[PDB]
Design a protein around this ligand. Structure first.
Ligand code: CLA
Ligand SMILES: CCCCCCCCCCCCCCCCCC(=O)OC[C@H](CO[C@@H]1O[C@H](CO)[C@H](O)[C@H](O)[C@H]1O)OC(=O)CCCCCCCCCCCCCCCCC
Ligand code: HEM
Ligand SMILES: CC1=C(/C=C/C(C)=C/C=C/C(C)=C/C=C/C=C(C)/C=C/C=C(C)/C=C/C2=C(C)CCCC2(C)C)C(C)(C)CCC1
Ligand SMILES: CC1=C(/C=C/C(C)=C/C=C/C(C)=C/C=C/C=C(C)/C=C/C=C(C)/C=C/C2=C(C)CCCC2(C)C)C(C)(C)CCC1
Ligand SMILES: CCCCCCCS[C@@H]1O[C@H](CO)[C@@H](O)[C@H](O)[C@H]1O
Ligand SMILES: CCCCCCCS[C@@H]1O[C@H](CO)[C@@H](O)[C@H](O)[C@H]1O
Ligand SMILES: CCCCCCCS[C@@H]1O[C@H](CO)[C@@H](O)[C@H](O)[C@H]1O
Ligand SMILES: CCCCCCCS[C@@H]1O[C@H](CO)[C@@H](O)[C@H](O)[C@H]1O
Lengths: 244, 56, 56, 137, 56, 97
């Protein structure tokens, strides 16, 4: 009747967001009096693209395909937060909590590995004005925080770190330190990402929405040791709306 | 300074198992007959010929 | 020996700058672990200058 | 060095009254501490919550103060969080929760005093090693 | 702890450093004893101690 | 240029007192009555423009308010440091005994 953990375990389904069937083309009424919230937000990436970095800036850099090497470990889920109604009828989702990040490594043609913290941490996303009902026309656009892929305790292979670790290349006791400044002095990245959620299906009765998303964010900079890359993530999403 | 790469490319071997092609494409699938597969085949051939030499 | 000389200079009325400036370069250089023969490695080849550098 | 009466003299209460433990009470304290407490509190640390240790200074700053026999005996009957705000008998071994922590079922008032005495005497012997963890091993 | 470093004698005679990374940098050198300036470029020195002819 | 922000933080009041905006929660154990109840509330309602603003946490009892007042001298505030507050590090900074 209804799937259990043991039906699902090891199939790959646990990394998939819930779907809605083709008859779910309704509209979910919004009431300016009542406060709303997203009870569950899920994001399932289906493609990862990395912007190439050519030697010459005269020709435009394109986003290219990558291969996922870290397996079915990529989806964000159990995300919740307030869904506010704004004076102009627009809606604002303010992300509070949930499984809102996954470390992800993709591999470019020729082998170069691109680790990233796929995330919507601190997401604040808004609709168009005058949304009396969320429909297959509604969309959310917003910005989120991308903190360092490694947190401050992380130690490099020579035991150097930010909130822990050596502060020099100890294997080279008398080397000049200037050339090694960037590797020796760890730095914690915090940058902005951008995301659009295109609502494609709505179940007006249950308060459930689904569609596609596209996000853009920087990859891992390995605590300031190298320049990050621009990543574009596409996939499907699911959300349940509730009165708060 | 590539010497044998052009000869592979001349007759249709243009891709790598690592996903690049010499025409600049990404995400292509060359099948077995990538630059690497060609290299592998020649190494195995070399070994088989070596053994055949011994017999003869 | 460095400390003995510095203390003697201070006792004789020199400033701290004058006391340390009276220490021969060569004596200070012996008081450095880079010149200790028990700091090398079996396959760390060549002159001591090749490690820490040519002292200036 | 010896385990003297002076070593075995510890604060009984918050007022300043002391009690002198016997060598037998010391032995019993160690035995009973091992029996009921050591699985988590070995060496004066706390395995399941390393933030809180059994150092006398830490106990003194607990609410209510636990750097004396009375405080410790009371803790073993009705354990609280460090600020005294919550009663934690349901997740910490005590006489009050002897039903769910069965090793507490056969601990007498005498036994509690012995354990309390162990906790107070041990740092007087081992110093910073008590509650120190692996750094001091 | 507001650690500072002042130099007496040598190149840095009379100078005081208060910048914590600078002070720390000098403290790292001080574990080796007296502090020297080295030419690390002429021999492409690698910063790793070698033994002397006494050791060899 | 390149600076370790955590080391620099040690040269501020963060290195001297409990910083209500940055310091890991286990530091509240140093003083009577602060841990775990008040410590949780303090971290949850951070950051604070001043130390006194800790008294504005909604729902405090009068005893709790008095404990806070008695401890203000042991508190400070500095700018939020991303490296100290990310990763849930205020609740568990990877240090045990
Ligand atoms: C007593 C012997 C001896 C000693 C103590 C020295 C000492 C020194 N030499 Mg001189 N030298 C020697 C003889 C020696 N030399 C000989 C015979 C030659 C002609 C080859 C040279 C030519 C020479 C040159 C060209 C240079 C030196 C240099 C140096 C300095 C650096 C040494 C170094 O890096 O070693 C490195 C030592 C090793 C890497 C260890 C060798 C270990 C071997 C390989 C072990 C072999 C294992 C064996 C195969 C196992 C067998 C197993 C089997 C039985 C089962 C040092 C002052 C350098 C210097 O600074 O010049 C100014 C330099 O450039 N030497
Ligand atoms: C007939 C042919 C002769 C045989 C050919 C010999 C070649 C074989 C190679 C020998 C191995 C040594 C090479 C070391 C690598 C290297 O680069 O060295 C290179 C070093 C030179 O060091 C060089 O110096 C330069 C400046 O002059 C630069 O600083 C270079 O960076 C530095 O490499 O060569 C030597 O020092 C050789 C002398 C070593 C003698 C030391 C005494 C050790 C004796 C140990 C005895 C053990 C025996 C017991 C075993 C049983
Ligand atoms: C009868 C034996 C025990 C005694 C006498 C004892 C004693 C104590 C004392 C005195 C404290 C407070 C420390 C302080 O204020 O600094 C404490 C805290 C604690 N103990 Fe025990 N303990 C015993 C058994 C155990 C066991 C078996 C466990 C593990 C299952 C345990 C886990 C803890 C934890 C997690 C805390 C911190 C509790 C909190 O504040 O939330 N204890 N214990
Ligand atoms: C150093 C160098 C280099 C290199 C080189 C090389 C890499 C080489 C090689 C080479 C080679 C690699 C060669 C070879 C060879 C060979 C041979 C010559 C052989 C043979 C043989 C034989 C004789 C056999 C026999 C037999 C057998 C085994 C079996 C049975 C039969 C018979 C009898 C037939 C270069 C120039 C870069 C530059 C500079 C430096
Ligand atoms: C069809 C085909 C192809 C091709 C192929 C080829 C080219 C092949 C070959 C081949 C070969 C090339 C083979 C072989 C061989 C051999 C052998 C089989 C052998 C052997 C041997 C032996 C058995 C010996 C022995 C001995 C020794 C070792 C020593 C001393 C003694 C004696 C004499 C006993 C390709 C891929 C293009 C593709 C499609 C399909
Ligand atoms: C005969 C065995 C051939 C060995 C196969 C090596 C893997 S293939 C190898 O992959 C690298 C990283 O992905 C690329 O940089 C490189 O261009 C490619 O040749
Ligand atoms: C000695 C190792 C043998 C490796 C065999 C791997 C074949 S791989 C196989 O090759 C076919 C024909 O080239 C392609 O059509 C197909 O895309 C590819 O997956
Ligand atoms: C003797 C061991 C040689 C193993 C041969 C494995 C290479 S097989 C090769 O793999 C590529 C991706 O990696 C595919 O694009 C291609 O279809 C397939 O033929
Ligand atoms: C504590 C009585 C309040 C009624 C709530 C249900 C019983 S709570 C009670 O808590 C005790 C620890 O104090 C345990 O001994 C006992 O096993 C547990 O069920």
């Amino acid at each position: 009747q209804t799937l259990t953990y043991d039906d699902i375990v090891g199939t790959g389904l646990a990394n998939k967001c819930p779907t809605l069937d083709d008859t779910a083309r309704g509209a979910y009424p919004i009431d300016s009096s009542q406060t709303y919230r997203i009870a569950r937000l899920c994001l399932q990436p289906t493609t990862f693209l990395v912007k190439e970095e050519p030697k010459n800036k005269r020709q435009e850099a394109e986003f290219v395909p990558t291969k996922l090497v870290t397996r079915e470990t990529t989806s964000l889920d159990q995300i919740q937060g307030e869904l506010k109604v704004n004076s102009d009828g627009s809606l604002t989702f303010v992300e509070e909590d949930g499984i809102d990040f996954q470390p992800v490594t993709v591999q470019m043609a020729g082998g170069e590995r691109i680790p990233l913290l796929f995330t919507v941490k601190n997401l604040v996303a808004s609709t168009q004005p005058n949304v009396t009902s969320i429909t297959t026309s509604t969309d959310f656009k917003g910005e989120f925080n991308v903190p360092s892929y490694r947190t401050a305790n992380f130690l490099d292979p020579k035991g150097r770190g930010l909130a822990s670790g050596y502060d020099s290349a100890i294997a080279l006791p008398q080397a000049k330190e200037e050339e090694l400044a960037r590797a020796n002095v760890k730095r914690f990245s915090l940058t902005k990402g951008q995301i659009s959620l295109n609502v494609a299906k709505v179940d007006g009765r249950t308060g459930e929405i689904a569609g596609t998303f596209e996000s853009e964010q920087l990859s891992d900079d390995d605590m300031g040791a190298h320049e990050p890359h621009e990543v574009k993530i596409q996939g499907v999403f699911y959300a349940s709306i509730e009165p708060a | 300074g590539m010497f044998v790469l052009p000869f592979m490319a001349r007759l249709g071997v243009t891709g790598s198992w690592s996903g690049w092609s010499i025409t600049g494409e990404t995400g292509i699938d060359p099948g077995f007959w990538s630059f690497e597969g060609v290299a592998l085949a020649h190494i195995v051939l070399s070994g088989l010929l070596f053994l055949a030499a011994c017999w003869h | 020996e460095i400390n003995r000389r510095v203390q003697a200079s201070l006792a004789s009325g020199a400033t701290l700058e004058e006391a340390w400036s009276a220490i021969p370069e060569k004596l200070a250089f012996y008081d450095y672990i880079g010149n200790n023969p028990a700091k090398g490695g079996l396959f760390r080849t060549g002159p001591m200058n090749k490690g820490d550098g040519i002292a200036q | 060095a010896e385990l003297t009466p002076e070593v075995l003299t510890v604060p009984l209460n918050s007022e300043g009254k002391t009690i002198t433990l016997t060598e037998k009470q010391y032995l019993e304290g160690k035995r009973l501490f091992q029996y009921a407490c050591a699985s988590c509190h070995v060496g004066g640390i706390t395995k399941t919550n390393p933030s809180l240790d059994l150092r006398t200074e830490t106990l003194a700053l607990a609410t209510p103060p636990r750097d004396n026999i009375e405080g410790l005996v009371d803790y073993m009957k009705n354990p609280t969080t460090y600020d005294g705000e919550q009663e934690i008998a349901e997740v910490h071994p005590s006489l009050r929760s002897a039903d769910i922590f069965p090793k507490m079922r056969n601990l007498t008032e005498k036994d509690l005093v012995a354990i309390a005495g162990h906790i107070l005497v041990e740092p007087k012997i081992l110093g910073d090693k008590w509650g120190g963890g692996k750094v001091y091993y | 702890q507001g650690v500072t470093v002042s130099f007496y004698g040598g190149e840095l005679n009379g100078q005081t450093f208060t910048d914590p990374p600078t002070v720390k940098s000098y403290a790292r050198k001080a574990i080796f004893g007296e502090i020297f300036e080295f030419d690390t470029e002429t021999l492409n020195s690698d910063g790793i101690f070698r033994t002397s002819p006494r050791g060899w | 240029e390149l600076v370790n922000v955590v080391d620099e933080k040690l040269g501020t009041a963060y290195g001297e007192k409990i910083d209500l905006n940055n310091t890991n929660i286990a530091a509240f154990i140093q003083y009577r009555g602060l841990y775990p109840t008040l410590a949780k509330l303090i971290v949850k309602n951070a950051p604070y423009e001043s130390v006194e603003d800790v008294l504005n946490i909604p729902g405090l009892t009068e005893r709790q308010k008095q404990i806070l007042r008695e401890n203000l001298e042991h508190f400070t505030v500095t700018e939020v440091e991303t490296a100290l507050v990310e990763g849930g590090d205020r609740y568990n900074n990877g240090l045990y005994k």
